[PDB]
Amino acid sequence: TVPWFPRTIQELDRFANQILSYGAELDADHPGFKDPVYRARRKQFADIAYNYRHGQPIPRVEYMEEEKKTWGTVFKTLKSLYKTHACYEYNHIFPLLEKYCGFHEDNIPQLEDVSQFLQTCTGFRLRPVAGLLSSRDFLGGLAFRVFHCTQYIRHGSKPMYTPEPDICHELLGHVPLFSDRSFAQFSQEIGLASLGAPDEYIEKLATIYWFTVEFGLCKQGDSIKAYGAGLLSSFGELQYCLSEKPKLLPLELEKTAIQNYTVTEFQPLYYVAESFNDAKEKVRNFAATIPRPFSVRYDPYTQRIEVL
Ligand SMILES: NC[C@@H](O)c1ccc(O)c(O)c1
Numbered sequence: 001t002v003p004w005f006p007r008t009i010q011e012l013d014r015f016a017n018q019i020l021s022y023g024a025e026l027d028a029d030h031p032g033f034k035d036p037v038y039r040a041r042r043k044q045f046a047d048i049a050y051n052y053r054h055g056q057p058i059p060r061v062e063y064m065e066e067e068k069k070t071w072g073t074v075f076k077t078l079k080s081l082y083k084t085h086a087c088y089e090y091n092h093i094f095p096l097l098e099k100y101c102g103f104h105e106d107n108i109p110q111l112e113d114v115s116q117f118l119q120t121c122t123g124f125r126l127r128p129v130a131g132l133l134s135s136r137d138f139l140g141g142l143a144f145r146v147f148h149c150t151q152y153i154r155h156g157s158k159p160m161y162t163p164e165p166d167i168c169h170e171l172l173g174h175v176p177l178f179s180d181r182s183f184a185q186f187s188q189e190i191g192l193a194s195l196g197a198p199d200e201y202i203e204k205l206a207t208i209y210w211f212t213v214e215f216g217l218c219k220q221g222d223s224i225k226a227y228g229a230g231l232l233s234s235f236g237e238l239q240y241c242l243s244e245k246p247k248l249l250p251l252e253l254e255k256t257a258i259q260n261y262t263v264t265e266f267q268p269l270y271y272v273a274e275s276f277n278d279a280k281e282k283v284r285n286f287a288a289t290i291p292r293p294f295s296v297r298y299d300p301y302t303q304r305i306e307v308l
């Protein structure tokens with residue numbers, strides 16, 4: 001019977017008791033696996049997320065010198081690419097993040113400050129997330145313009161590599177696009193489409209998410225640039241996605257929704273969105289095909305979903 005979904009923004013608190021308990025940092029393969037200090041630091045951030053409740057300021061954390069060093073390395077190496085490789089919406093907001101959110105090589109921005117900045121731009125807000133949420137819960141938060149965001153940093157031994165999202169990927173990859181109004185409306189439509197959808201459609205929407213929010217390319221006049229968070233936070237793949245090597249296809253959701261992808265190599269193919277307004281309209285149409293015995297609307301005045 002129709003799977004449960006949150007109907008008020010506060011009900012997202014129910015997700016904390018629904019994450020994968022045995023994290024990536026526990027795999028022998030993890031860059032930080034043999035490091036007990038790293039292991040304890042990850043538990044520390046996991047506890048902060050576990051105890052967080054909607055409405056509370058997100059706890060500030062004093063990052064260690066080793067952690068600020070890893071951030072500085074990632075920030076400085078990626079920043080050189082944005083002006084030529086990132087979509088216009090990214091470069092438009094980046095200077096404002098540098099000025100009001102402290103995006104600078106010597107300092108890791110605190111999530112509370114970034115979340116307040118996002119709220120002023122598009123009403124998106126962040127909440128710290130312990131480990132891996134199911135695709136259903138993760139996509140469901142988007143319906144309320146809530147992005148579940150990691151607060152820990154990748155291990156310092158391999159600054160240019162992370163097998164999982166970390167704070168560098170959230171802040172340099174995702175945050176700038178959530179400041180844009182059309183991208184915000186587009187991400188929210190994916191979220192609304194997921195509410196109470198059957199498991200096999202959640203997987204189709206998670207694939208659409210992967211090919212837009214994480215690895216999407218934008219058409220910008222006669223040029224093509226990157227807006228996917230996974231590209232904007234990957235030095236190597238960001239340069240590769242705008243070269244002659246990968247295959248480019250127009251975003252077509254009935255097609256994108258079932259395309260396979262790997263998470264370990266550079267993507268062999270990417271979908272190009274005409275604009276975020278257009279992608280939003282395509283998602284809205286795709287959502288009408290999802291069998292759900294009802295319709296949903298978000299009411300921003302009360303932060304509640306209305307089930308028709
Ligand atoms: N859903 C798979 C999980 O590894 C994931 C979800 C959303 C993201 O933005 C991401 O970077 C990773």
Ligand SMILES: [Fe+3]
Nearest residue numbers: 165174214229
């Ligand atoms: Fe991501």
